[PDB]
A paper describes a structure:
At the end of 2022, the XBB.1.5 variant emerged, a descendant of XBB that acquired two substitutions in the spike (S) protein, S:G252V and S:F486P (S:S486P compared to XBB.1), and a translational stop in ORF8 (ORF8:G8stop). To gain structural insights into the recognition of the ACE2 receptor and evasion from neutralizing antibodies by the XBB.1.5 S protein, we performed cryo-electron microscopy (cryo-EM) analysis of both the XBB.1.5 S ectodomain alone and the XBB.1.5 S–ACE2 complex. We determine the structural basis for the interaction between human ACE2 and the S protein of XBB.1.5, showing similar overall structures between the S proteins of XBB.1 and XBB.1.5. Our recent report showed that the S486P mutation in S is a determinant of enhanced affinity to human ACE26.
Similar to BA.2.75 and XBB.12,3, the XBB.1.5 S ectodomain alone was reconstructed as two closed states (closed-1 and closed-2) at resolutions of 2.59 Å and 2.79 Å, respectively. The receptor-binding domain (RBD) one-up state, frequently observed in the structure of the SARS-CoV-2 S protein, was rarely found in the XBB.1.5 S protein. Although the overall structures of the closed-1 and closed-2 states were essentially the same in both protomers and trimers between the S proteins of XBB.1 and XBB.1.5, some differences were observed in the specific details. In the closed-1 state, a structural difference between the S proteins of XBB.1 and XBB.1.5 is the distinct loop structure consisting of L828 to Q836 within the fusion peptide (residues 816–855). In addition, R567 and D571, which have no interaction in XBB.1, form a salt bridge in XBB1.5. A common feature shared by both the XBB.1 and XBB.1.5 S proteins is that the cryo-EM maps of the large part (residues 829–853) of the fusion peptide are highly disordered in both closed-2 states. Another common feature is that the closed-1 cryo-EM map showed higher resolution and well-packed RBDs, while the closed-2 cryo-EM map showed relatively lower resolution in the RBDs than in the whole map, suggesting that the RBDs are mobile. By cryo-EM analysis, a structural comparison of the S proteins of XBB.1 and XBB.1.5 in closed-1 revealed a difference in the loop structure consisting of L828 to Q836 within the fusion peptide (residues 816–855). Despite a structural difference in the fusion peptide portion, which is essential for membrane fusion, the overall structures of XBB.1 and XBB.1.5 were highly similar.
Residue numbers in the entry:
A (entry chain A): 753 to 1051
B (entry chain A): 903 to 1139
C (entry chain A): 554 to 622, 629 to 677, 689 to 802
The structure:
Amino acid sequence: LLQYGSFCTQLKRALTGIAVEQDKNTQEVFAQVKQIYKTPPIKYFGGFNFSQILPDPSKPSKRSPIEDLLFNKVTLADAGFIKQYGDCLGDIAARDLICAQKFNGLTVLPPLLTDEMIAQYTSALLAGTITSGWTFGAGPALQIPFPMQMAYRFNGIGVTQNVLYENQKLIANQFNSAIGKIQDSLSSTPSALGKLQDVVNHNAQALNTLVKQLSSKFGAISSVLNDILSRLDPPEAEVQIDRLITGRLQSLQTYVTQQLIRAAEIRASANLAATKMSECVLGQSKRVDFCGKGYHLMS
Amino acid sequence: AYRFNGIGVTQNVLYENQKLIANQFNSAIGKIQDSLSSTPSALGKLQDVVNHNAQALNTLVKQLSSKFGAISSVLNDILSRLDPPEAEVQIDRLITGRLQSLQTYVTQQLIRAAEIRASANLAATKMSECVLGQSKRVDFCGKGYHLMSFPQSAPHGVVFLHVTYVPAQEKNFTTAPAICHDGKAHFPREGVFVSNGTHWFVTQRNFYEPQIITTDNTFVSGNCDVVIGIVNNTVYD
Amino acid sequence: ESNKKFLPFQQFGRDIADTTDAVRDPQTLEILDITPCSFGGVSVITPGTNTSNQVAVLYQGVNCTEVPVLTPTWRVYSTGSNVFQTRAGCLIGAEYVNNSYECDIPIGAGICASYQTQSQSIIAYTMSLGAENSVAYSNNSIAIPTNFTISVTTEILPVSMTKTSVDCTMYICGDSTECSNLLLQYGSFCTQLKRALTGIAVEQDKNTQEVFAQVKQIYKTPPIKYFGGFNF
Ligand SMILES: *[C@@H]1O[C@H](CO)[C@@H](O[C@@H]2O[C@H](CO)[C@@H](O)[C@H](O)[C@H]2NC(C)=O)[C@H](O)[C@H]1NC(C)=O
Ligand SMILES: *[C@@H]1O[C@H](CO)[C@@H](O[C@@H]2O[C@H](CO)[C@@H](O)[C@H](O)[C@H]2NC(C)=O)[C@H](O)[C@H]1NC(C)=O
Ligand SMILES: *[C@@H]1O[C@H](CO)[C@@H](O[C@@H]2O[C@H](CO)[C@@H](O)[C@H](O)[C@H]2NC(C)=O)[C@H](O)[C@H]1NC(C)=O
Ligand SMILES: *[C@@H]1O[C@H](CO)[C@@H](O[C@@H]2O[C@H](CO)[C@@H](O)[C@H](O)[C@H]2NC(C)=O)[C@H](O)[C@H]1NC(C)=O
Ligand SMILES: *[C@@H]1O[C@H](CO)[C@@H](O)[C@H](O)[C@H]1NC(C)=O
Ligand SMILES: *[C@@H]1O[C@H](CO)[C@@H](O)[C@H](O)[C@H]1NC(C)=O
Ligand SMILES: *[C@@H]1O[C@H](CO)[C@@H](O)[C@H](O)[C@H]1NC(C)=O
Ligand SMILES: *[C@@H]1O[C@H](CO)[C@@H](O)[C@H](O)[C@H]1NC(C)=O
Ligand SMILES: *[C@@H]1O[C@H](CO)[C@@H](O)[C@H](O)[C@H]1NC(C)=O
Ligand SMILES: *[C@@H]1O[C@H](CO)[C@@H](O)[C@H](O)[C@H]1NC(C)=O
């Protein structure tokens, strides 16, 4: 193989580029603000109830109930684990596909940002948008009572503020009911989180195909190098080894190309998500059907 | 003044602070050259394209020294050291290897071209929206309230200079949603009620400028029994 | 020793990748299982060579106990120097501290490394998300600014790249005729390559034209440059 060029340097470079791009995407999406705001201890906002989206201090990981349901709904499977070789050598007689992947030179790297840091970023964004409206997204944060912020947002869509000031309780009740229905709507439908499951399914399928490809003969007497080496003299052995080498190289090339295309698609999706975070959360958008159906109020 | 009215600030603010705004703009423009020159890694995106192209071409050239399983990597030596019928089988390996290298190079170039096209489309949209007009989209033409943009050309790229407005030196105040007077509720037209401790005024949101509460800048539209937190005072006519 | 329940007529065991992992000893009929011995990857963390020559070594995905200390001939200290365990594996040659700074060199799950004067040394820490803040929220209080600042920022965007062309015959066969004749019967791959390269070359110019040709009138500035005190 040493005399076939430098294809594998190119493969390593492409894989490293994709790995760096993933962390860049996450950092771009989830790091809009540089100040870690925290909610006031007393939770009274004119009748609006935010308990379903604020972090829960009772649980150890400090996640909102909706975040808990979202994390329980999706199966993660592959992740980074230290001493994973020890678990593989434990040999409980249940040889999973992960150990087979590891023993053939395929590894999975952990992300730079943990889940707790992302949860902290989300909590800071929520506290900022609750306590300051949209001022913290364009300079220093300026406090303002929540009903006055809602009156400003209603003026933003062409409705006078006395409409809000005379229907505060009904609007608060409607908002509370709409927030409450979200958990039931998410839990009842099992196919809601298809997009997030598709990524895991695609990665697992690609890795499994790459591992299974090692059993092909590609026109040789056998698919095992040791058997070929023991059953033949060398000069008849190079011609048998060459076919296997070429087949495995082709499989690696195909895998890398597919990974590159998927990475490009994921980058486009991440850019869209970052734009939506910038425009719908840190301010009020006048673009039609960009931040929901109807006249956008807040995200 | 038109651009300041576009972000919700009255034009008399500009007309009374023209010299200070001009000085601030001049200083901000002057700092740009020092900021660009001091940092050596600012123009990484433009250098990456050249580096990638040079690396790809160098790899393609260096790939010609591989044997790919033949006796030699030189066609003339193979032709001179062997009869033809033994020579086609040696030439075929080299041909296949070089073809594979060309295929890989072309595929990588296509992917890079797609990425560059996406970047160029984004740049064209930014040029259309931030330079030829004033944008209300948050964080699209800089950080803060966008005022105006200027374009510049660079090797294989464009550089946008965004000029924006940032508030500073905030102060605390006591506020109320409405004012009760003669059994009627009054709401501000454009602004918010503010109290310095003793008296009440109305001011615009993005700049402190108190004014006497009159019937000219308020409307009634309701009674004084529904609004929560109403405060009763006097309204001048 | 293997716990697999081999049938009396079975002599070998295979896996998904078609590799033998269970064997029966020819002399004593006992079932044994085979596992490859330890292996892994090594990463090197270093600042620029213009600064120092000290390095740190990260063994990836390996519990730092039963450390290999081998295929690599060079030996790290493996002792004396600080040894730390991260979710990415083991780190050797860097000291862990309580202080949190901005990330300099990424390592793994929330762990970064830096070169600090402390005697210069390499330290590892947990990255900091940002400075703490807490706005005073009240339901009858507001905050209003009293001054402003004019800010100028920059943004850089690539537009086009290099246009290249390749000749198949000269690259593959040079000036030889036998090689050209042999290549003539391999199809029309090179026509496709030429078409793709030409398409990319045209697309580059299209991108530049789309970006830089918004207006069709060539305006020029007046000779006298006075714009109310603004300096351009
Ligand atoms: C905000 O909503 C939550 C849940 O929607 C309320 O918590 C409920 O409180 C009642 C009475 O204390 C309990 O019987 C329920 O079991 C609680 N539900 C949950 C999920 O904890 C909370 O009381 C609401 N906020 C206010 C101020 O009433
Ligand atoms: C709040 O604003 C009112 C309105 O200007 C201030 O009242 C004035 O105070 C100055 C100096 O104290 C007097 O010269 C004026 O005659 C007052 N105006 C009126 C209509 O009486 C008041 O002092 C301000 N309070 C604070 C704490 O700043
Ligand atoms: C608003 O900010 C500007 C700039 O920070 C202030 O102008 C400065 O005023 C001080 C006080 O004399 C001068 O020493 C500086 O030279 C001024 N800066 C410039 C650029 O001219 C201005 O005073 C502030 N306004 C208020 C009401 O505080
Ligand atoms: C606009 O700015 C430029 C540079 O910032 C000014 O040019 C400077 O003028 C002074 C006095 O004539 C010279 O001492 C400097 O050497 C000049 N700098 C440069 C880079 O040429 C220019 O004067 C300013 N415009 C006005 C109308 O004052
Ligand atoms: C406004 O009040 C808060 C708390 O009451 C305080 O932290 C802040 O410094 C005050 N701002 C000014 C400008 O006095
Ligand atoms: C003015 O407001 C106070 C506080 O709400 C209230 O007690 C008082 O009755 C009001 N004045 C009149 C004339 O109703
Ligand atoms: C093979 O011979 C050895 C003696 O060296 C003996 O211990 C063993 O039981 C024999 N096994 C069989 C299957 O005959
Ligand atoms: C490393 O190995 C030891 C011994 O088996 C084990 O006790 C320890 O838990 C392992 N480290 C981790 C992080 O699990
Ligand atoms: C870091 O902080 C923890 C807090 O409990 C402390 O136990 C530990 O000793 C500190 N690190 C060092 C090196 O002292
Ligand atoms: C909100 O207003 C109510 C008036 O009913 C008051 O009792 C409460 O203290 C206010 N909240 C805060 C945080 O001061």
